[PDB]
Write a protein that binds this ligand. Sequence first.
Ligand SMILES: Cc1ncc(COP(=O)(O)O)c(CN)c1O
Ligand SMILES: Cc1ncc(COP(=O)(O)O)c(CN)c1O
Ligand SMILES: O=C(O)CCC(=O)C(=O)O
Ligand SMILES: O=C(O)CCC(=O)C(=O)O
Lengths: 284, 283
Amino acid sequence: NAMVVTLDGEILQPGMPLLHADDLAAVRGDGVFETLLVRDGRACLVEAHLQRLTQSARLMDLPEPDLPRWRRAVEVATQRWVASTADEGALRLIYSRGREGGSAPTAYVMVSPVPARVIGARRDGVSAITLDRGLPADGGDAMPWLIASAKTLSYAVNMAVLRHAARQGAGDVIFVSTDGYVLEGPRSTVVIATDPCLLTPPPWYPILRGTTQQALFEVARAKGYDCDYRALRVADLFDSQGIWLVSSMTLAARVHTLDGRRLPRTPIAEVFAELVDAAIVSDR
Amino acid sequence: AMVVTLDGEILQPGMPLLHADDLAAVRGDGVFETLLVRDGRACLVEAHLQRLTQSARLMDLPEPDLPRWRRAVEVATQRWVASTADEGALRLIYSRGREGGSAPTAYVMVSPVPARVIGARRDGVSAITLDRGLPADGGDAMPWLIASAKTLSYAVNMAVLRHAARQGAGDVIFVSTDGYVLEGPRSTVVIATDPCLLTPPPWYPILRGTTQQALFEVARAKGYDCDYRALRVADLFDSQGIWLVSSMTLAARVHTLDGRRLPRTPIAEVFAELVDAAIVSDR
Ligand SMILES: Cc1ncc(COP(=O)(O)O)c(CN)c1O
Ligand SMILES: Cc1ncc(COP(=O)(O)O)c(CN)c1O
Ligand SMILES: O=C(O)CCC(=O)C(=O)O
Ligand SMILES: O=C(O)CCC(=O)C(=O)O
């Protein structure tokens, strides 16, 4: 089922507990993490995930992550998963503040099966609803204490928002600020397609920076696509050629229905998935 | 630290309890409660198990088995009471369980009361107001944000406290973007206006304070009028006193707010006594 690789590089026995009852990841969600996709024998975009992991650790007053130590744990876990199966894997880096009163932070690497919801979201897409996030667009930089750009282990609200939309037949959520500007998804980055130009909310918004979105901008710009960071509104969502919820594991899930209103399908939608396919391998 | 799971086992300390895929650790996905052990028993057990039931309901968690929770609490309490007469910090950890699994994670943990608690009770704290990022109407207009649930996802709460620590402040008072007083990152805000006690209303995106409510009950019987009002920052500086009330710290008087020192009022002498009798009013 689940596989664990500590920073020393040894693979822990399945079915055995790793974390103590007083680890700050469990009692207070006090830590940062990253999620990587294993595809065709290798984890995708390792450096971009370790770069953001280094930034999330700085925003959380966590010890600076040892990148050579993290690269070995991911490489050991990667080769163990690829040897075990040819299916894609969900590789996650867990970096917590450690036990209460202790000094050493908790850090390990975990590979798990990719959920079945991913193959449906890639192939079929998702129905999404816009939901008030409660944050204004100024929240990321003007209010740094909210650390909205840090990918922390405190994801209880993100999961509850998804369950709220599930009870209403929605497969995902697009967060909208009190100002009326598009922010992000609870687990993905919002990218739209306008005439052909791809847009995404600007990074000074209280949102996470998408590793997949930036790599998508690199491959798309090198192929002739114009990309930019703009203040998107809900109206701009409905007039686009396509909306996608982009992330590291789900890759690209087009929003075919937004707030119950179906959105038309464009020829750019078949190339968009290929654009995200080349993005996660642009490191190779 | 001592751990007593709802299964009934007392774990040998220094041994791991949770697997690497527990949703408490990978997603902060769970609810918890913090209780104070004083004079041989945890304080306001029933009121904390009631809020645990409400936080679990907002989180689509299985309804907690209160008789099993009471056993883990009683077993963990007497193990601490047997070891020392000092106060203890008892916490109920209730998570969704392992990723992909079905059984939820549930255990009770007792630890020493931190040294910051003795100072906050005795001396008080210097606090700063900080924007919470939520509007005051956000609790009712956005129920999906489950701001009334006491979850294990306290990364923002702890980061906010560290930010104020770098500025010489001992705690924080959250203010909404609309400018209304909400709560602390780890406490409930109670102020003193003319002998009247006020606190922000619970339909705000805040937690309902078990200690604050038990305080309102004892205070009303002693002649004080208590009520829930929409407080602004001006009400903080014009008040007779500000306290950050909670289950473990009890009452932490704010002696300095945003750098401005606040005078001491005769109500400051009585307030600590009111919270002491509040947390044992169940007995
Ligand atoms: C809040 C949030 N925003 C955006 C993203 C997308 O980031 P990435 O492309 O690196 O997966 C994620 C990752 N699930 C996320 O949790
Ligand atoms: C966010 C928050 N609000 C309020 C409180 C106070 O609640 P209670 O008096 O029931 O402990 C706490 C306790 N730390 C808290 O963490
Ligand atoms: O599993 C979840 O709900 C979120 C994980 C994620 O980021 C994803 O869907 O790829
Ligand atoms: O989050 C908690 O409840 C623990 C902190 C607390 O209650 C306190 O400091 O009094």
